[PDB]
Swiss-Prot record, chains A, B:
GO terms for molecular function: ferrous iron binding; manganese ion binding; mannonate dehydratase activity. This is Mannonate dehydratase. Keywords: Iron, Lyase, Manganese. Disulfide bonds: none annotated. PANTHER family: MANNONATE DEHYDRATASE (PTHR30387:SF2). Pfam families: UxuA. HAMAP family: UxuA.
Amino acid sequence: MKWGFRWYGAAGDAIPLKHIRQIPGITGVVGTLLNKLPGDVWTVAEIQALKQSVEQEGLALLGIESVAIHDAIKAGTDQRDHYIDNYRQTLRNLGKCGISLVCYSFKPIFGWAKTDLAYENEDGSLSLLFDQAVVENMQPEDMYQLIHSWEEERLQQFQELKAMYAGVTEEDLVENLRYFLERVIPVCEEENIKMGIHPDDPPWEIFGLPRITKNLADLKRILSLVDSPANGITFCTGSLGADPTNDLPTMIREIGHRINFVHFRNVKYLGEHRFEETAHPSVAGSLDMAELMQALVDVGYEGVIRPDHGRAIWDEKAMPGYGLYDRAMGLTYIQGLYEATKAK
Amino acid sequence: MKWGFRWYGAAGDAIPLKHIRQIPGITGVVGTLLNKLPGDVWTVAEIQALKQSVEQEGLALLGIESVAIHDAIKAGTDQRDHYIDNYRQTLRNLGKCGISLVCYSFKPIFGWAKTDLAYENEDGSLSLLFDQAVVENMQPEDMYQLIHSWEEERLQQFQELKAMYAGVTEEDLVENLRYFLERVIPVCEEENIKMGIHPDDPPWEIFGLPRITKNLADLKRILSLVDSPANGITFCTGSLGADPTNDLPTMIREIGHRINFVHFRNVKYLGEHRFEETAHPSVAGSLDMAELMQALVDVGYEGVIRPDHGRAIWDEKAMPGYGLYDRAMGLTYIQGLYEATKAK
């Protein structure tokens, strides 16, 4: 079990690396060149740089996340062939630098959605909240404006993608992910890398925009596109946990053999279709974590795992779910779960 | 299981209470009026004040620690009768304010000993270290000077104590605690309070000075003095852990029914009789925390529990062990072990 911890590298991440390496148990981190944009090619030079700054503080670079999934490959445009080629190229670069894990997501226009991104709790901490009620009475562009902070120089940025993905049905997207996998997975194996796709949060349709990975249904389907251990899935218990109809345990046991990454974060049901992020321990939220930790051992999972967004606590300037405190605190609780559970 | 956390109240403790209450899982804290000196009487006014400042931040006052164990009661002087009376008096005050737990220690001259109180680790964190080799080549007074930071005044101060306990032996000291225990235990049962004697650290003799509360053999002798639940023993797995001869888990199963308080701390051996403090998780120490938590469940211990000393991390100014960080990082770890353990 490689205890990981997301890090934005020596840039923007106000979290020094000499501090993360002081977390008890950490085995490494999961980085991502925030410079490059969707579609760019990651040069061995940049990858080597990142990996180095990490190993300097005696931390291993467990895998890179935020990857370049250009809208072309997703929508199904024609330029996708050039981007799927620039993607397989970086894939060769990552393998050349030893990287073996890549996390990615096939989401349409919104990489993430949240109505209230500063919800205060009883303990006086801030959290990200998503209320379906608010998503209804709000225009699709407003969400864009929100997750990208009057910005008119970005208005067309959204109005274009909308007109682009317009017409792309659910099954169409699955097919575009097929084309993508069929041309990136093969090289993954050559370079010896496992790709892990990030589920949708929330795990349900919003703004009539079709999303595939949101339940054991699609998950199973994702694995079918290309039957290969390289075509795996990261497990963000939180993201999927947001939908109470999603039996997290069974799932892990159902498709655990294909989990290459895992975001062990807890969520709280502050209402019907509305919910929030909270502390890792079960008492804090609505997800029985112990049970979840038991299900991972069952599938014999021993890969990289990292706590996900938590809360903005202890008077930190950082936006909730991006600071060191609650995340690091979360990283020790799960090891406590693991240890004991594994002690059987 | 009441998840506790030591707090020095709104004084000296640079750790705001609104921050501790943000630790996931905390159910309360364990305070102590740092104002009063050995032998003083705690007035309901002061106790009520403390309890209040705690409940203000929605935290419960699980119990008070640092208590007034005047050298008179310990050495066996004559003024002990007046102090054992001022002690039973505060005991009445604590009961009047709802307090039900009191931690105390029957140590001679040194309340704690450490040779290097700024030991740097690989991860770049500071820790408290105790090397028996250094304790040998150093004068008894030097330790005093050390744990009380060259004053000629302190010299006499120590020189006095030395003469005060000159001639006192283990069994000699056992009676002094007996005496005291026979006049404090009955008051505890009436006020509805439980006590927990603290084990020495290191759990062995230093500078010739006698010490009882060190190994299992004596631990039983403590309970023996006055067979009653109020006569309990605060299990500090860290101290008892320094001596590899102490079968931590076994003694928990033996005198476990009488444990009224527990400090889940971990120690990392670094030589013969030289150890240091480290992160709570087994991977960063030498004690099997998973196994220890287990033993606590077998006995059915669901009382107050708090992580103890940790390390100086993240460039925290606080002295290693007294900070907020590494201590919370553990309070969520031990919770994992428990949840994971009870999970069957």
